[PDB]
Amino acid sequence: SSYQIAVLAGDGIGPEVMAEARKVLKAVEARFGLNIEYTEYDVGGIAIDNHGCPLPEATLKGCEAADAILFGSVGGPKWEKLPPNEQPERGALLPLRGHFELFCNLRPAKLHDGLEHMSPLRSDISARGFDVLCVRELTGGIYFGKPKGRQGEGESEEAFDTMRYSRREISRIARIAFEAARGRRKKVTSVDKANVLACSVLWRQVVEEVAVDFPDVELEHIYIDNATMQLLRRPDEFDVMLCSNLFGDILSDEIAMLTGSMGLLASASMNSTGFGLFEPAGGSAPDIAGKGIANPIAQILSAALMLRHSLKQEEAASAIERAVTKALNSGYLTGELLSSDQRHKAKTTVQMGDFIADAVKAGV
Amino acid sequence: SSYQIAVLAGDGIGPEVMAEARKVLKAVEARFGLNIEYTEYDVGGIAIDNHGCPLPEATLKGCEAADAILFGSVGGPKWEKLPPNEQPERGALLPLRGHFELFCNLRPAKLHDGLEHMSPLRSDISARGFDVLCVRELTGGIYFGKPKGRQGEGESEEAFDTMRYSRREISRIARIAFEAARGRRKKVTSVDKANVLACSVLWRQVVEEVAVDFPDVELEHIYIDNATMQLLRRPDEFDVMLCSNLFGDILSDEIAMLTGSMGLLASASMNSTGFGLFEPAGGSAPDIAGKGIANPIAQILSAALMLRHSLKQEEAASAIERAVTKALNSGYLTGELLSSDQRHKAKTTVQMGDFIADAVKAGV
Ligand SMILES: CC(C)[C@H](C(=O)O)[C@@H](O)C(=O)O
Ligand SMILES: CC(C)[C@H](C(=O)O)[C@@H](O)C(=O)O
Ligand SMILES: [Mg+2]
Ligand SMILES: [Mg+2]
Known part of the structure; x- marks a missing residue:
């Protein structure tokens, strides 16, 4: 049967890195025969702009109907004048964790070979x-x-x-x-x-x-x-x-x-039934948004954690992780991962997503 | 008039570094004409051994009669089997801070030139x-x-x-x-x-x-x-x-x-009347206690902070600080401040105290 994913890309770089996560996921769906449907909902800053609050009713109900939440990043300068207690990051995350009883947060961090x-x-x-x-x-x-x-x-x-x-x-x-x-x-x-x-x-x-x-x-x-x-x-x-x-x-x-290397780090927040919310560790980096510079690895590895912990698709999760390793040791790095004498070898967000999706499709 | 200092050296290296602080202080007393009397009291581990509790009544009353507390370090392996809530560090420090309303803690930290x-x-x-x-x-x-x-x-x-x-x-x-x-x-x-x-x-x-x-x-x-x-x-x-x-x-x-370089770092805890407790930032390092290896700088700089904030003796406090700087840039360093190919240039605790006291006496 069809899994249902609620996609909450949020603000800043969220949508551009989410696009690359979807790309990779499409390669995984084809290779492993998974049937996954996605619905997109506003959250955070964009939700305040479009709906008056950081977590609209329609979004919350949409998450209730899903098997998991694939979450981007929320927040930016534009909404910091709001009191710290009405800003988008707390306004979206605390009620989501509270509502779904997401008691377990996993934050894996490692130093990758060569970096x-x-x-x-x-x-x-x-x-x-x-x-x-x-x-x-x-x-x-x-x-x-x-x-x-x-x-x-x-x-x-x-x-x-x-x-x-x-x-x-x-x-x-x-x-x-x-x-x-x-x-x-x-x-x-x-x-x-x-x-x-x-x-x-x-x-x-x-x-x-x-x-x-x-x-x-x-x-x-x-x-x-x-x-x-x-x-x-x-x-x-x-x-x-x-x-x-x-x-x-x-x-x-x-x-x-x-x-x-915060662009490489993902996070899982889960309840005891395996429903979770999966997100990059870093923030919405609003100053680089729209330029194709952002590193989509964290968002791609979020999708891998979602496959593993919520959808119980270990082989598919592993394939993504190996495609990321292949990128890192084939010199496919984004700008923030290079000493700035190297900065012209940088790959863009799209090039990273293409490489990783191609690797999954090639049977990595 | 005579200032009164309560000396609470505690456990581990406390007494050996306190001896060097007293040495330096004697040089300052002579150079600036200060009249200071010291009374020593048990606190921490030694107080549990000698009196059954980490902060005896007699010690508390002794601090009440003083202008300031010059404090060493408390705790060690021997008392960790006690519940974390009866161990010497919390047992001595929380009631002292509570009793004397030591609301302000200052913890200065800097990277010293050359280190x-x-x-x-x-x-x-x-x-x-x-x-x-x-x-x-x-x-x-x-x-x-x-x-x-x-x-x-x-x-x-x-x-x-x-x-x-x-x-x-x-x-x-x-x-x-x-x-x-x-x-x-x-x-x-x-x-x-x-x-x-x-x-x-x-x-x-x-x-x-x-x-x-x-x-x-x-x-x-x-x-x-x-x-x-x-x-x-x-x-x-x-x-x-x-x-x-x-x-x-x-x-x-x-x-x-x-x-x-935690051996260089001191701390002040004070109330609004200028009474305080002055201590090294680090712990009691029970494994090096008794060997003349410990760095007495933190305890010496504690005494400088006491002169400044509690006794209002800015010139005397400054003189100590300059004597420490002189030691550091004359190669008078203890073992933990040397790369271990250099470890044989190390000065002992006593040599450090002698140098610093001599410097104060020479008019640094
Ligand atoms: C936005 C904030 C409420 C949140 C938290 O404190 O849990 C954040 O700092 C985090 O680490 O996810
Ligand atoms: C011993 C402990 C109670 C104390 C504190 O938590 O204040 C210590 O960690 C400190 O920093 O002085
Ligand atoms: Mg946080
Ligand atoms: Mg502490």
């Missing part, structure tokens, strides 16, 4: 490589906890946010981390602030409870402040990093920047 | 230098907010922590940041998560209120996740970074590690 020099780390550290999967709990903690608000006036006006976690919420994300570790390098590093936070005392406790089901996986705990430091000295010693909502927000961006 | 190569940043980034002062609010936010605890049992057992800030608490730390910026490079960067947290919406609002008193200082706002990334790409563009409690905990460690 170590783009990392902002010292060259002897980046030479060692790294490959870290950040597992972030997405629907609990301080993002959605109540009470939240403010009271009082004048000097004594106060605001409050509540961080809350239940054993059940911790155990379900921890299990995901352990199962992932089992397929990787069998180490989970859980990140908390258990010397200060009641939530973190419970976090650490529950993670140790879950660990009894995985005697083959090594478990260590690290404080969030220390983790930001250790990622700079020994990123090669981490495998799976397991984080609460806010800690994962922070650490995943640190790790992404350590690659030096 | 850029110790930074874990790529050499073209570290070559540009940086000098960032982290101002962290220390007594509010999620560290001390109520309610805090847990309820329920089994799968539905839940924990909670509450982040709370008042206009008054935000305005007082913001003013400190702006006044510091005014003496530095006239830029404050305020760090928040205003797209998610009610506290951060209020934070950003109050900081903009305070800014009207400082039309000469540039103000920008950045999200905490983005800040962790931008520190890796352009640390030279930041001057004063203004942070809430938890965000400052995280960012200040990231910045410290970017120096590559």
Whole structure:
């Protein structure tokens, strides 16, 4: 039967990189005999312009009818004057995560062979490589906890946010981390602030409870402040990093920047039934939008993660991943991945998409 | 009149680096005619061993009678089996900050001339230098907010922590940041998560209120996740970074590690009357304790900050800072500051203290 994908390209470079993801997907559909239908919906900035809000009713209903959401990027200068609490990025993402109970965020990041020099780390550290999967709990903690608000006036006006976690919420994300570790390098590093936070005392406790089901996986705990430091000295010693909502927000961006290659990084946000939202790690880069410069790899790898986790099409997901590897080691690189004495070897967004789609079609 | 200093050397390397701070201070007392008396008290690990708790009554009362606290480092392997919530570091520091209302934490970090190569940043980034002062609010936010605890049992057992800030608490730390910026490079960067947290919406609002008193200082706002990334790409563009409690905990460690030289970094925690606690940024390094290897610079610069901020002895504080600079550019370096082909040029803890004290005495 026909899978149904909701396509939410958003703002900035979203539509131009989404076009290349669709191109690649068409090559995969033909090679593997998949029947996939796509419907496009406004989200973010474009939705505010066209409908008055960043997540229109029609869009939300469209996602409810889909097997997965293939998401681009949202936001730009034009809407920053809106209060930070009505801007498009938060306005679209928090309710989507909340509505669909997308509790599990996966953010894989690795240094690719040959591109170590783009990392902002010292060259002897980046030479060692790294490959870290950040597992972030997405629907609990301080993002959605109540009470939240403010009271009082004048000097004594106060605001409050509540961080809350239940054993059940911790155990379900921890299990995901352990199962992932089992397929990787069998180490989970859980990140908390258990010397200060009641939530973190419970976090650490529950993670140790879950660990009894995985005697083959090594478990260590690290404080969030220390983790930001250790990622700079020994990123090669981490495998799976397991984080609460806010800690994962922070650490995943640190790790992404350590690659030096955010155009290569994708993200999956999923619920327990396998429905998810799949997006590039980076932003909407409105200043390069419309010029065919943007790197479509992150959006293409988003589609690969969607095939794998939501559609259960492992062979098709793998084929995309290998087509990307082929591009990277055949010199098909975009401008931001070249030292700028090389900048004239740069491929455009379309050339990248064509190459990758052709590779899939050729049986890579 | 006689100043009174409470000396809390703590664990690990604390006592051996504290001895060098006292040595330097004796040279300063003679050169500037200061009358300072010191009383030593147990804190941390040693206090648990000798008194059953990390912050004995006698120690707390001793700090109440002092003009300032000169603090070493607390913690070590021996006490980690204690729950993270009874260990010495949290057990000593949170109640001290709480009791004395030490709302303002200053954590200056800079790359020193000639030591850029110790930074874990790529050499073209570290070559540009940086000098960032982290101002962290220390007594509010999620560290001390109520309610805090847990309820329920089994799968539905839940924990909670509450982040709370008042206009008054935000305005007082913001003013400190702006006044510091005014003496530095006239830029404050305020760090928040205003797209998610009610506290951060209020934070950003109050900081903009305070800014009207400082039309000469540039103000920008950045999200905490983005800040962790931008520190890796352009640390030279930041001057004063203004942070809430938890965000400052995280960012200040990231910045410290970017120096590559944590043995050079000191911290001040102060209340509005000028009483403070002054400590090295790093930990107690129990594995090198007792060998005369530890770098005493951080502890010596702690004493300089104490002279400046608590005792109002600017000339004496400055003299120490220049004696440290003299050591660094006369090849007086400890082992961790040398590439290990150079490791035999290393000076010991005592040699460093002697050199620095002699320099102060010679009128540096
Ligand atoms: C836009 C914002 C609400 C979001 C988050 O904080 O989760 C973003 O920073 C992220 O990492 O996806
Ligand atoms: C020991 C711990 C409570 C403390 C904090 O979180 O403030 C420490 O990490 C720090 O940075 O001083
Ligand atoms: Mg983020
Ligand atoms: Mg800390």
